Amino acid sequence: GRVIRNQRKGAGSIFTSHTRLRKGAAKLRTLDYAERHGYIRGVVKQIIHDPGRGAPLAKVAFRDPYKYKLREETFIANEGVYTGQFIYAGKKASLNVGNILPLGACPEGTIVSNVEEKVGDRGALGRTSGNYVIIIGHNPDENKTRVKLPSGAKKIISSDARGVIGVVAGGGRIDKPLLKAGRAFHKYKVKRNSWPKTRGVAMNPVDHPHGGGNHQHIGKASTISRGAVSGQKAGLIAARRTGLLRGTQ
Amino acid sequence: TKRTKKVGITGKFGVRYGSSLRRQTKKLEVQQHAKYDCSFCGKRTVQRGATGIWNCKSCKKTVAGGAYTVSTAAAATVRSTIRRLRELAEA
RNA sequence: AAUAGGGUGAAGCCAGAGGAAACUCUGGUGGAGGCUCGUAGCGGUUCUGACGUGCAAAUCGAUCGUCGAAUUUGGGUAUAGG
RNA sequence: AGUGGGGAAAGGUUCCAUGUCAACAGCAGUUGGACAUGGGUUAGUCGAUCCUAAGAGAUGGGGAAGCUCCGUUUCAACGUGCUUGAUUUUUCAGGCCAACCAUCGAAAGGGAAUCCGGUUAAAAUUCCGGAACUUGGAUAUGGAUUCUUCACGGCAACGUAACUGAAUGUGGAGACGUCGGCGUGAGCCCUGGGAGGAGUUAUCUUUUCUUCUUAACAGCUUAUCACCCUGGAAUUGGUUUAUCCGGAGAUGGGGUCUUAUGGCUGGAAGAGCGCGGUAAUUUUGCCGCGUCCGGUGCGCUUACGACGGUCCUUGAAAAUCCACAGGAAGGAAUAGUUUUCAUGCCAAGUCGUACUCAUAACCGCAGCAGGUCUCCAAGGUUAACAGCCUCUAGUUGAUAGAAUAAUGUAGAUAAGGGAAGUCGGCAAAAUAGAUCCGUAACUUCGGGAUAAGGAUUGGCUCUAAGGAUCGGAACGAUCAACUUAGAACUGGUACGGACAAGGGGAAUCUGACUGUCUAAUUAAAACAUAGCAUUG
RNA sequence: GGGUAAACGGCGGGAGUAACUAUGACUCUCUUAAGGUAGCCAAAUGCCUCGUCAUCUAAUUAGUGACGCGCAUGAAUGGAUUAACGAGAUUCCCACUGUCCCUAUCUACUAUCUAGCGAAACCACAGCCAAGGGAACGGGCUUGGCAGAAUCAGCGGGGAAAGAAGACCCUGUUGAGCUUGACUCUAGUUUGACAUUGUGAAAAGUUUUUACUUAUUCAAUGAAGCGGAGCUGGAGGUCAAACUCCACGUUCUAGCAUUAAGCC
RNA sequence: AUAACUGGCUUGUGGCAGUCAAGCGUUCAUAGCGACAUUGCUUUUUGAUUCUUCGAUGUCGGCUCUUCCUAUCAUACCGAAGCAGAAUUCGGUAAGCGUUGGAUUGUUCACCCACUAAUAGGGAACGUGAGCUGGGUUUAGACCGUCGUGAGACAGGUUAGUUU
RNA sequence: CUUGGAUUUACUGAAGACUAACUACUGCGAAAGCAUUUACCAAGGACGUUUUCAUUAAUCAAGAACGAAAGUUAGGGGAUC
Ligand SMILES: CC[C@H]1CN2CCc3cc(OC)c(OC)cc3[C@@H]2C[C@@H]1C[C@H]1NCCc2cc(O)c(OC)cc21
Ligand SMILES: [Mg+2]
Ligand SMILES: [Mg+2]
Ligand SMILES: [Mg+2]
Ligand SMILES: [Mg+2]
Ligand SMILES: [Mg+2]
Ligand SMILES: [Mg+2]
Ligand SMILES: [Mg+2]
Ligand SMILES: [Mg+2]
Ligand SMILES: [Mg+2]
Ligand SMILES: [Mg+2]
Ligand SMILES: [Mg+2]
Ligand SMILES: [Mg+2]
Ligand SMILES: [Mg+2]
Ligand SMILES: [Mg+2]
Ligand SMILES: [Mg+2]
Ligand SMILES: [Mg+2]
Ligand SMILES: [Mg+2]
Ligand SMILES: [Mg+2]
Ligand SMILES: [Mg+2]
Ligand SMILES: [Mg+2]
Ligand SMILES: [Mg+2]
Ligand SMILES: [Mg+2]
Ligand SMILES: [Mg+2]
Ligand SMILES: [Mg+2]
Ligand SMILES: [Mg+2]
Ligand SMILES: [Mg+2]
Ligand SMILES: [Mg+2]
Ligand SMILES: [Mg+2]
Ligand SMILES: [Mg+2]
Ligand SMILES: [Mg+2]
Ligand SMILES: [Mg+2]
Ligand SMILES: [Mg+2]
Ligand SMILES: [Mg+2]
Ligand SMILES: [Mg+2]
Ligand SMILES: [Mg+2]
Ligand SMILES: [Mg+2]
Ligand SMILES: [Mg+2]
Ligand SMILES: [Mg+2]
Ligand SMILES: [Mg+2]
Ligand SMILES: [Mg+2]
Ligand SMILES: [Mg+2]
Ligand SMILES: [Mg+2]
Ligand SMILES: [Mg+2]
Ligand SMILES: [Mg+2]
Ligand SMILES: [Mg+2]
Ligand SMILES: [Mg+2]
Ligand SMILES: [Mg+2]
Ligand SMILES: [Mg+2]
Ligand SMILES: [Mg+2]
Ligand SMILES: [Mg+2]
Ligand SMILES: [Mg+2]
Ligand SMILES: [Mg+2]
Ligand SMILES: [Mg+2]
Ligand SMILES: [Mg+2]
Ligand SMILES: [Mg+2]
Ligand SMILES: [Mg+2]
Ligand SMILES: [Mg+2]
Ligand SMILES: [Mg+2]
Ligand SMILES: [Mg+2]
Ligand SMILES: [Mg+2]
Ligand SMILES: [Mg+2]
Ligand SMILES: [Mg+2]
Ligand SMILES: [Mg+2]
Ligand SMILES: [Mg+2]
Ligand SMILES: [Mg+2]
Ligand SMILES: [Mg+2]
Ligand SMILES: [Mg+2]
Ligand SMILES: [Mg+2]
Ligand SMILES: [Mg+2]
Ligand SMILES: [Mg+2]
Ligand SMILES: [Mg+2]
Ligand SMILES: [Mg+2]
Ligand SMILES: [Mg+2]
Ligand SMILES: [Mg+2]
Ligand SMILES: [Mg+2]
Ligand SMILES: [Mg+2]
Ligand SMILES: [Mg+2]
Ligand SMILES: [Mg+2]
Ligand SMILES: [Mg+2]
Ligand SMILES: [Mg+2]
Ligand SMILES: [Mg+2]
Ligand SMILES: [Mg+2]
Ligand SMILES: [Mg+2]
Ligand SMILES: [Mg+2]
Ligand SMILES: [Mg+2]
Ligand SMILES: [Mg+2]
Ligand SMILES: [Mg+2]
Ligand SMILES: [Mg+2]
Ligand SMILES: [Mg+2]
Ligand SMILES: [Mg+2]
Ligand SMILES: [Mg+2]
Ligand SMILES: [Mg+2]
Ligand SMILES: [Mg+2]
Ligand SMILES: [Mg+2]
Ligand SMILES: [Mg+2]
Ligand SMILES: [Mg+2]
Ligand SMILES: [Zn+2]
Known part of the structure; x- marks a missing residue:
């Protein structure tokens, strides 16, 4: 047969992300002395649309502690953040929406966003519109914090890891139907080349494992082993169960 | 007049x-x-x-909001939760 | 970079009429839409027309689809034979 | 929306003149994009050149037997650094910085600066004449400024001929989608008077056609928006075609700004244009007169403006230029400073530039009915940039002559019947614009719908309605656009008179829809799609 | 061993009956599970088949509506609907007509004839029939009919006319595309051991756990503030003497912070 | 060297025709029929075979047009009857002359409606595609049902498919 | 379901519900209904009044608000039944 569309994506020729119009990488500040020991104050200059992103971004200006200079940061805007708002980041920062605090400095039940998986990676968790991380609890003896991720998973992170207080702005986006192929066209026109999708069952056996037949049908179980190889993993990979989800999980 | 009954x-x-x-x-x-x-x-x-971007024509203040409303219910709930935990922490 | 001229007439807004209220009716205004008739354009349905040692190794004629967007297109650039 | 006038790609001398006809131009040939000989492309301002885009790709490194692969600042000791006071001691003294930063990548993106008239056989935003401009350099004079050292004025928005400002920093310009109506301008279209020229003239026609123009650049002036001062608002007012604004200060009164755009003047009438009278084998002319003053708009095209709509879509970068913050350093009195004020001096290299851009200069073996990106765009009819006729411009090219059998190809018509033809109404016919009337089932309430189904439409002569600017007025004066409605008359009952231009209805199967593919036999019920669900 | 069908898929054979006739509402047993539910249908899916009934017509293997033990319908291998849309397939009606009865006439361009110009396909030799025999359908052979130069416009009976070493079929120890529980392997991946690989403790009988950091691995930064201690306060109730803990310059505001003042 | 057309041999089968005469026919074998048997013809069926053609003879049907056969449906003239007439049936010479318009189906075949003197049957490479048409079949697209783990199969249905 | 340690036992945690006992011929609300604490928000009946207005009222076709449980649509949760 032929190399399938799953496998053609890794080469990344026509499958790279369309990034001309993007407004920069959304990151927290580099963890420095001011954030480790006290707090630093910045001012929100802009709240802008980032193409390919549902969440707006905030452009926040900070002073450089060591040279006469201004540092502009690209944060993910939490909902309620406004232009001209003062943002405080550090260990001694107060519990206000938009402030960047270590996870250990936030009491249980604190809603936080753009949370660091590891100390100083500048944000990994809860970055999409309407999403957040709930702080479940602390283990001060081991310097660890238990959090709940948007997927429902519980994670243990260093208490020195940082997050931004509040919920990511732009939520409820999925509530509206797209209603049109053109709307999805414009949605992925500034994301990447993954739309539209031809069904593999509608191809020929060269093109896909589902192709061929005198009727369109998969023919074998569409649940595929985790240990299958590239060119085989088309369908439901390592599926623990299938069918309509009935009852609680 | 009323042009459409419901759409x-x-x-x-x-x-x-x-x-x-x-x-x-x-x-x-x-x-x-x-x-x-x-x-x-x-x-x-x-x-x-x-x-997520809501601008005021008069005072030129831009605020981050919801996709289709200025404030979501989840954000209002988080605002009150944060206010409460701030009060307890600062006594 | 390109895309005549019409039709329909969405929100919003103004006025009048009715109602105790919750609210309703009418006339304008407005100018929405992967809306519509229809040029350029893009396409290529039917005649199973012409031609079929052709004007042409795919064209010609009428008829036809679509025609403001998932539109059409120049140039630059990327992807290379299991 | 050209058979007109230019260009991009591509060609490469096909351009122009002279000669010329063996071959080629599927007839001919005295002609030619053919053949032969010559000639021809002039730039500081137009491009390239420079910037960065998607991307391409060295270096340090790391792979790989290796050809080479990765990577683009990456685990790198990465400046052939600058700025000054200099020194003439051709030595120096230092002061700052070195996040990023090899390089290539656009004749449609970004970007310093030129126009008019004339001139050739063939070149011209390139030559000639005149008139400007930019950048770089040099540099003096005038002005400006200083004894209160680095200017004044205005309440303010801010103004000006100038009117210190290092390191470093902050900003702005470069720099940005699309659509809708409105407004303004320009060019074009239309039109009145006058001064010329041509045409018609049996008759009519103060007539029909035509000339009456003004570049870049300089000065003054000119604007929506925005802003400032005054003032303090419900009896809420102002206000757009579009309902937005005002105690976060409206209406009212007075101002400030951008100069987009227009006006006046200089450029500039000396040019160009239109006439009349003359010179001459004659290179080329010489003389005189005129070239003026208006009006109009749902007009067309285009530019700009203030607005409004739209997106789970929010619509490049960099070179480069400026301003501001900061306060280093240096500055006067018998004199000091500055080339962001005026004037003056010098220079601007390299390569491209002819011509075609297509029913004969490109690609399809060719002078091939195919293909190949884009700019400008007159009158009439009309909704119309459609169709039809015409002006400017351009062509009149395509082997021809004589006849007019059959069978064709393209097109027409047909008594009575009206799908009996045929697999099948295939093909053709019928309908068709506009105004008014009337419009069913079903429906996701949006539609269906131009459903279905009817009436009218010419020409002429009238009538009515619909506005603007002035004057202190429910009125007068002047000026003005085509829309709509009604009536009479009229004719071989014709009239969307050519052109242009839906046939309709009752149902079943199927795909929801718009969209997409088998270039060159299949456009579909196939693919996609929104929606739904599952998996990691 | 368990779970999972909006995973691939599957959803059947058997055994009796109502005061005319007809029908059968009326129970268990097997296949590796369940045994086709709601719906829909001679449907683009029904063999029999032009199914049967009704309607449409003068007449209908067509159409529509019904029926349903359905060869072999059926639920995201989606079922049933469905307004709108469709150069999709189909039936009927009105209008319309040369589609037809059944043809006729007209126009231009051909064809035609001339001057000039001037190919190609094809060609064993060639070119009148009838019968015979024959590789079983002759232009030629045999036997007959016959048979007279040179030709023009048409034409499509024949030349088993031309175009192509049949594309269907079979054979070949000839392939190729595709597939799978074929034969034989394989990139990848997973699992163990050895090496990289060192320093301790404890416990199990060599194995398990956790301590160290320098090997190795991951990440960031223009390698900016690390580790320990000490200055200053706030505290514990101080029972010797100040030990332990905490902090140690920035939070109404869209301003500013750069090239050290000061002291010795 | 070998199948899927035509053609050739064959004629089981299909079709058509005789001979005998048990019975039928009020009686009566033979007007008209005719069992049990038996002899043939035909090549308008389908088989059997594999001779020709695989360096290709264009494979359904219809439309169009000509011709031929006769085993005569009609028309001419006649013989026979269980022929009174009328109608009908059996038969002879006979192919001179005609043998239709439509609904459904791609159909050949079929089946109805209707007219008619009658609506006979066949052949000509199952006449006839450089005559047409292209509805069917039978390339490649697509759908369904059953079958297959699958790629795929179906001589099942369905829709679209260059005729030099 | 269980020698793979079930059931049981102690400690700890997480989820959703629900508010026992007190709880009654007791309360509140137009009805449906309402039961852990506290705060906030706006209502309400009765009572008291030598306050105020003076017929403003009663019941009501049309027309409205609310309306147990179950059920429907879409998110979230899904302990127990
Ligand atoms: C002289 C020109 C006429 C002469 N006449 C005579 C009468 C007649 C009658 C017809 O039917 C009554 C007819 O049927 C069509 C055609 C004619 C011819 C047609 C021809 C022009 C026509 N030639 C062929 C195609 C064509 C294409 C064009 O672009 C085009 O534009 C100029 C024109 C054409
Ligand atoms: Mg999808
Ligand atoms: Mg898909
Ligand atoms: Mg396919
Ligand atoms: Mg495969
Ligand atoms: Mg598989
Ligand atoms: Mg398959
Ligand atoms: Mg398929
Ligand atoms: Mg399918
Ligand atoms: Mg299957
Ligand atoms: Mg449950
Ligand atoms: Mg459209
Ligand atoms: Mg349309
Ligand atoms: Mg065509
Ligand atoms: Mg054709
Ligand atoms: Mg021909
Ligand atoms: Mg392109
Ligand atoms: Mg035109
Ligand atoms: Mg041109
Ligand atoms: Mg020439
Ligand atoms: Mg010639
Ligand atoms: Mg010649
Ligand atoms: Mg030459
Ligand atoms: Mg230039
Ligand atoms: Mg790049
Ligand atoms: Mg490289
Ligand atoms: Mg190297
Ligand atoms: Mg470059
Ligand atoms: Mg350029
Ligand atoms: Mg740009
Ligand atoms: Mg000039
Ligand atoms: Mg020229
Ligand atoms: Mg000059
Ligand atoms: Mg506009
Ligand atoms: Mg104008
Ligand atoms: Mg200029
Ligand atoms: Mg002047
Ligand atoms: Mg906009
Ligand atoms: Mg030129
Ligand atoms: Mg051409
Ligand atoms: Mg011609
Ligand atoms: Mg007729
Ligand atoms: Mg007639
Ligand atoms: Mg009729
Ligand atoms: Mg018909
Ligand atoms: Mg018919
Ligand atoms: Mg017929
Ligand atoms: Mg038929
Ligand atoms: Mg037609
Ligand atoms: Mg109508
Ligand atoms: Mg469709
Ligand atoms: Mg095709
Ligand atoms: Mg192909
Ligand atoms: Mg086609
Ligand atoms: Mg069943
Ligand atoms: Mg059933
Ligand atoms: Mg059935
Ligand atoms: Mg039914
Ligand atoms: Mg059927
Ligand atoms: Mg039927
Ligand atoms: Mg019919
Ligand atoms: Mg039916
Ligand atoms: Mg089934
Ligand atoms: Mg199925
Ligand atoms: Mg379509
Ligand atoms: Mg031969
Ligand atoms: Mg013969
Ligand atoms: Mg023979
Ligand atoms: Mg021969
Ligand atoms: Mg002989
Ligand atoms: Mg012929
Ligand atoms: Mg022939
Ligand atoms: Mg062969
Ligand atoms: Mg063998
Ligand atoms: Mg292959
Ligand atoms: Mg026989
Ligand atoms: Mg027989
Ligand atoms: Mg044979
Ligand atoms: Mg053969
Ligand atoms: Mg042949
Ligand atoms: Mg032949
Ligand atoms: Mg006979
Ligand atoms: Mg007879
Ligand atoms: Mg035949
Ligand atoms: Mg033939
Ligand atoms: Mg043929
Ligand atoms: Mg045929
Ligand atoms: Mg096919
Ligand atoms: Mg088709
Ligand atoms: Mg078909
Ligand atoms: Mg077909
Ligand atoms: Mg309780
Ligand atoms: Mg109580
Ligand atoms: Mg009550
Ligand atoms: Mg009442
Ligand atoms: Mg009531
Ligand atoms: Mg739910
Ligand atoms: Zn505001």
């Missing part, structure tokens, strides 16, 4: 896409095209730019 702003879609999808669109699109009261200057001059 309203969704009368631009004609007969396409299904009635359930069109009334579901109508609910959120009246909200995304409405004018909201500015919490800064007090005028009802706040309109959406892109999703």
